[PDB]
Design an enzyme around this catalytic site. Structure first.
Site, PDB file in Angstrom:
ATOM      1  N   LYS A  41       0.371  -1.694  -0.109  1.00  0.00           N
ATOM      2  CA  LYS A  41       0.288   0.027  -0.158  1.00  0.00           C
ATOM      3  C   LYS A  41       0.984   1.060  -0.012  1.00  0.00           C
ATOM      4  O   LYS A  41       0.527   2.097  -0.447  1.00  0.00           O
ATOM      5  CB  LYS A  41      -1.177   0.601   1.238  1.00  0.00           C
TER       6      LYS A  41
ATOM      7  N   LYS B 233      13.021  -0.938   1.553  1.00  0.00           N
ATOM      8  CA  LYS B 233      11.254  -0.393   1.697  1.00  0.00           C
ATOM      9  C   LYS B 233      11.738   0.917   1.666  1.00  0.00           C
ATOM     10  O   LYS B 233      11.942   1.544   2.583  1.00  0.00           O
ATOM     11  CB  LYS B 233      10.833  -1.047   2.572  1.00  0.00           C
ATOM     12  CG  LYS B 233       9.244  -0.441   3.249  1.00  0.00           C
ATOM     13  CD  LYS B 233       8.216  -1.130   4.160  1.00  0.00           C
ATOM     14  CE  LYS B 233       6.817  -1.506   4.114  1.00  0.00           C
ATOM     15  NZ  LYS B 233       6.305  -2.163   5.194  1.00  0.00           N
TER      16      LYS B 233
ATOM     17  N   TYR C 172      17.188  -9.739   3.434  1.00  0.00           N
ATOM     18  CA  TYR C 172      16.406  -9.831   2.464  1.00  0.00           C
ATOM     19  C   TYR C 172      16.149 -11.056   2.122  1.00  0.00           C
ATOM     20  O   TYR C 172      17.173 -11.982   3.084  1.00  0.00           O
ATOM     21  CB  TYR C 172      17.718  -9.831   0.887  1.00  0.00           C
ATOM     22  CG  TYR C 172      17.971 -10.525   0.041  1.00  0.00           C
ATOM     23  CD1 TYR C 172      16.748  -9.705  -0.996  1.00  0.00           C
ATOM     24  CD2 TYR C 172      18.393 -11.069  -0.769  1.00  0.00           C
ATOM     25  CE1 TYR C 172      16.120 -10.924  -1.889  1.00  0.00           C
ATOM     26  CE2 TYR C 172      18.295 -12.197  -1.466  1.00  0.00           C
ATOM     27  CZ  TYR C 172      16.912 -11.994  -2.003  1.00  0.00           C
ATOM     28  OH  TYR C 172      17.052 -12.451  -3.968  1.00  0.00           O
ATOM     29  N   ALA C 173      14.588 -11.351   1.935  1.00  0.00           N
ATOM     30  CA  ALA C 173      14.775 -13.047   1.861  1.00  0.00           C
ATOM     31  C   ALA C 173      14.519 -13.410   0.849  1.00  0.00           C
ATOM     32  O   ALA C 173      13.033 -13.048  -0.269  1.00  0.00           O
ATOM     33  CB  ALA C 173      12.731 -12.849   2.592  1.00  0.00           C
TER      34      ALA C 173
ATOM     35  N   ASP D 131      -1.502  -8.484  11.449  1.00  0.00           N
ATOM     36  CA  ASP D 131      -1.660  -8.433  10.133  1.00  0.00           C
ATOM     37  C   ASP D 131      -1.419  -9.607   9.672  1.00  0.00           C
ATOM     38  O   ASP D 131      -0.919  -9.573   8.492  1.00  0.00           O
ATOM     39  CB  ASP D 131      -1.706  -7.602   9.921  1.00  0.00           C
ATOM     40  CG  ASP D 131      -1.635  -6.638   8.202  1.00  0.00           C
ATOM     41  OD1 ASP D 131      -2.420  -7.797   8.251  1.00  0.00           O
ATOM     42  OD2 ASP D 131      -1.167  -6.325   7.348  1.00  0.00           O
TER      43      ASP D 131
ATOM     44  N   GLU E 119       0.312 -13.080   1.907  1.00  0.00           N
ATOM     45  CA  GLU E 119       2.381 -11.180   1.380  1.00  0.00           C
ATOM     46  C   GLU E 119       2.795 -10.828   2.127  1.00  0.00           C
ATOM     47  O   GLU E 119       3.855 -10.260   2.566  1.00  0.00           O
ATOM     48  CB  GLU E 119       1.392 -10.122   1.495  1.00  0.00           C
ATOM     49  CG  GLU E 119       0.051 -10.553   0.105  1.00  0.00           C
ATOM     50  CD  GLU E 119      -1.498 -10.722   0.513  1.00  0.00           C
ATOM     51  OE1 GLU E 119      -1.524  -9.741   1.183  1.00  0.00           O
ATOM     52  OE2 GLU E 119      -1.811 -11.806   1.887  1.00  0.00           O
ATOM     53  N   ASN E 120       2.566 -10.883   3.836  1.00  0.00           N
ATOM     54  CA  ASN E 120       3.231 -10.954   5.439  1.00  0.00           C
ATOM     55  C   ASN E 120       4.622 -12.022   5.308  1.00  0.00           C
ATOM     56  O   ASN E 120       5.443 -11.456   6.140  1.00  0.00           O
ATOM     57  CB  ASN E 120       2.400  -9.880   6.147  1.00  0.00           C
ATOM     58  CG  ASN E 120       2.199  -8.934   5.256  1.00  0.00           C
ATOM     59  OD1 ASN E 120       2.197  -7.993   4.575  1.00  0.00           O
ATOM     60  ND2 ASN E 120       0.880  -8.444   6.802  1.00  0.00           N
TER      61      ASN E 120
ATOM     62  N   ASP F  57       6.017  -7.551   8.104  1.00  0.00           N
ATOM     63  CA  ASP F  57       5.523  -6.162   8.313  1.00  0.00           C
ATOM     64  C   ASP F  57       4.835  -5.767   9.426  1.00  0.00           C
ATOM     65  O   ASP F  57       3.260  -6.522   9.842  1.00  0.00           O
ATOM     66  CB  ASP F  57       4.527  -6.086   6.728  1.00  0.00           C
ATOM     67  CG  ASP F  57       3.596  -5.237   6.834  1.00  0.00           C
ATOM     68  OD1 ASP F  57       3.714  -3.744   7.442  1.00  0.00           O
ATOM     69  OD2 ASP F  57       2.679  -5.485   5.844  1.00  0.00           O
TER      70      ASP F  57
HETATM   71  N1  LIG Z   1      12.547  -8.326   3.232  1.00  0.00           N
HETATM   72  C1  LIG Z   1      12.231  -8.688   2.026  1.00  0.00           C
HETATM   73  N2  LIG Z   1      12.141  -9.369   0.936  1.00  0.00           N
HETATM   74  C2  LIG Z   1      11.982  -9.952  -0.178  1.00  0.00           C
HETATM   75  N3  LIG Z   1       9.907  -9.356  -0.377  1.00  0.00           N
HETATM   76  C3  LIG Z   1       9.891  -7.993   0.474  1.00  0.00           C
HETATM   77  C4  LIG Z   1      10.828  -7.858   1.723  1.00  0.00           C
HETATM   78  N4  LIG Z   1      10.104  -7.201   1.794  1.00  0.00           N
HETATM   79  C5  LIG Z   1       8.594  -7.005   1.639  1.00  0.00           C
HETATM   80  N5  LIG Z   1       8.934  -7.727   0.573  1.00  0.00           N
HETATM   81  C6  LIG Z   1       8.091  -8.216  -0.579  1.00  0.00           C
HETATM   82  O1  LIG Z   1       7.236  -6.483  -1.155  1.00  0.00           O
HETATM   83  C7  LIG Z   1       6.066  -7.230  -0.544  1.00  0.00           C
HETATM   84  C8  LIG Z   1       5.349  -5.823   0.306  1.00  0.00           C
HETATM   85  O2  LIG Z   1       6.283  -5.741   1.745  1.00  0.00           O
HETATM   86  P1  LIG Z   1       4.800  -4.598   3.214  1.00  0.00           P
HETATM   87  O3  LIG Z   1       6.510  -4.750   3.891  1.00  0.00           O
HETATM   88  O4  LIG Z   1       4.565  -6.281   3.196  1.00  0.00           O
HETATM   89  O5  LIG Z   1       4.554  -2.995   2.870  1.00  0.00           O
HETATM   90  P2  LIG Z   1       3.364  -2.891   3.220  1.00  0.00           P
HETATM   91  O6  LIG Z   1       3.801  -2.381   4.473  1.00  0.00           O
HETATM   92  O7  LIG Z   1       3.422  -1.871   2.152  1.00  0.00           O
HETATM   93  O8  LIG Z   1       2.790  -4.225   2.959  1.00  0.00           O
HETATM   94  C9  LIG Z   1       5.722  -7.788   0.715  1.00  0.00           C
HETATM   95  O9  LIG Z   1       4.435  -9.111   0.369  1.00  0.00           O
HETATM   96  C10 LIG Z   1       7.328  -8.832  -0.300  1.00  0.00           C
HETATM   97  O10 LIG Z   1       6.346  -9.716  -1.918  1.00  0.00           O
HETATM   98 MG   LIG Z   2       2.262  -2.073   6.478  1.00  0.00          MG
HETATM   99 MG   LIG Z   3       2.632  -6.169   3.736  1.00  0.00          MG
END
Ligand SMILES: Nc1ncnc2c1ncn2[C@@H]1O[C@H](COP(=O)(O)OP(=O)(O)O)[C@@H](O)[C@H]1O
Ligand SMILES: [Mg+2]
Ligand SMILES: [Mg+2]
Ligand SMILES: Clc1ccc(C2=CSC3=NCCN23)cc1
Length: 265
Positions: free
Chosen positions: A17, A36, A86-87, A130, A134-135, A148
């Site tokens: 978002k 991020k 990094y994942a 949450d 996706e998280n 997240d």
């Molecule tokens: N450390 C990470 N390594 C790999 N992919 C990531 C990582 N952090 C976020 N992502 C990708 O980015 C997307 C959004 O990250 P997130 O931190 O959940 O943002 P938001 O708070 O806007 O939801 C995740 O669903 C994932 O696909």
């Molecule tokens: Mg968030």
């Molecule tokens: Mg998220």
């Protein structure tokens, strides 16, 4: 301390978002990580500066192999930048799209890693609130990592801020604006376990208005292929009354879990 100048940026890892997440390498150490990126104007327009601050504070002080590290942050008058672990094997969301459903062993193993991670969190009275595919991210050996922490808090709690998108993972007490505690993460655990085995979440629905109805009524049914032991666990976590939901220690030593998970607690 850190600034944009200290990094070479790579390919986009994903979009949320507010968040726009990139692969990046730190110039002197060659350390690979995830950046991020958040746009200050949108953070202000939505008034969620308090969430960001919560995310940084909570996630930086947590240490668990099944929780994603946060190493630091900086900002530059248009943007804020969070420095993350990094994942490399991506999201559980992606994996579910790939395979359609997970088998019982894969599901049980994810549930154990999750329940360990949440157990550690609740022992500081931190509730995530949450938890969804996706998280949930995946490490180099395929291990699950919660990420997240924007929506996380200390319990008990009311909800002061507006729920934006999907209702699918939230318990009745939270959608209804009541107060709530640790037990919200246990409802979400039930929702996940169902979705892992079936391919879709138990209250999934065509409109917001109807999903709300199915959740407050706890209206879900199982496909025939869901085994009795899975049915037992899921039915125990999706209790309308929070106090009737089990403890994480009980989840971790549930028969279906111990029989199928390939990781210990
Ligand atoms: N450390 C990470 N390594 C790999 N992919 C990531 C990582 N952090 C976020 N992502 C990708 O980015 C997307 C959004 O990250 P997130 O931190 O959940 O943002 P938001 O708070 O806007 O939801 C995740 O669903 C994932 O696909
Ligand atoms: Mg968030
Ligand atoms: Mg998220
Ligand atoms: Cl910009 C930056 C650069 C390095 C790290 C780091 C976090 S863990 C770790 N072990 C060795 C270096 N390192 C974090 C951020």
């Amino acid at each position: 301390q850190w600034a944009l100048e200290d990094f070479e940026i790579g390919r986009p890892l994903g979009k949320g978002k507010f968040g726009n997440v990139y692969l990046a390498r730190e110039k002197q150490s060659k350390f690979i990580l995830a950046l991020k990126v958040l746009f200050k104007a949108q953070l202000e327009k939505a008034g969620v500066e308090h969430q960001l601050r919560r995310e940084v504070e909570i996630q930086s002080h947590l240490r668990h192999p099944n929780i994603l590290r946060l190493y630091g942050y900086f900002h530059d008058a248009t943007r804020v930048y969070l420095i993350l672990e990094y994942a490399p094997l991506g999201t559980v969301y992606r994996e579910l799209q790939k395979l359609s459903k997970f088998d019982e062993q894969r599901t049980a193993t994810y549930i154990t890693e999750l329940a360990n991670a949440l157990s550690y969190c609740h022992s500081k009275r931190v509730i995530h609130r949450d938890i969804k595919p996706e998280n949930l991210l995946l490490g180099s050996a395929g291990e699950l990592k919660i990420a997240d922490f924007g929506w996380s808090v200390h319990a008990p709690s009311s909800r002061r801020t507006t729920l934006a998108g999907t209702l699918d993972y939230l318990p009745p007490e939270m959608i209804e604006g009541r107060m709530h505690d640790e037990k919200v993460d246990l409802w979400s655990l039930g929702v996940l376990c169902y979705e892992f085995l079936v391919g879709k979440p138990p209250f999934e629905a065509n409109t917001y208005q109807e999903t709300y109805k199915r959740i407050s009524r706890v209206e879900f049914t199982f496909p025939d292929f869901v085994t009795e032991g899975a049915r037992d666990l899921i039915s125990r976590l999706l209790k309308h009354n929070p106090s009737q939901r089990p403890m994480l220690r009980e989840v971790l030593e549930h028969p279906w879990i111990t029989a199928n998970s390939s990781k210990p607690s």
